[PDB]
Amino acid sequence: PNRFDRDRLFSVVSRGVPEELTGLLEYLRRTSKYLTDSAYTEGSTGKTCLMKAVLNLQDGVNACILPLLQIDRDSGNPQPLVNAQCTDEFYRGHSALHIAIEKRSLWCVKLLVENGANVHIRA
Numbered sequence: 001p002n003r004f005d006r007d008r009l010f011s012v013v014s015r016g017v018p019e020e021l022t023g024l025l026e027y028l029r030r031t032s033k034y035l036t037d038s039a040y041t042e043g044s045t046g047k048t049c050l051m052k053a054v055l056n057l058q059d060g061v062n063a064c065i066l067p068l069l070q071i072d073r074d075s076g077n078p079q080p081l082v083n084a085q086c087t088d089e090f091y092r093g094h095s096a097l098h099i100a101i102e103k104r105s106l107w108c109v110k111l112l113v114e115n116g117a118n119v120h121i122r123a
Helices: 006-015 018-032 048-053 065-075 094-104 104-117
Strands: none
Touching: 006 018, 006 104, 018 048, 048 065, 048 094, 065 104, 094 104
16 A cells, blocks of 8 residues: 555545545655645646545535645645645636635634635635
């Protein structure tokens, strides 16, 4: 167990099980390869892992997003995976914080804004 693909991270974050995110931890450290890159995401839209996780939420509580954030911030680059968004023709500038507002959840908005998601991004 050294590698996943984008699909299995998407599947895991869809379910929302934190007990597996530990693996993603080491999968961030090696090969100097990060989640903000174009490989751990789709290529058509640009939907990253955080967006995919948010697009399905257990009523109003999740357990996979937060650990993913402190894992990413430990070795992430310029964009804290929260300042990054889609580069699609249909969706340009649309980031995860817009999704969090759209799904009517105070908690996730709180985490995103306190973790470094600046509210100045044009969708």
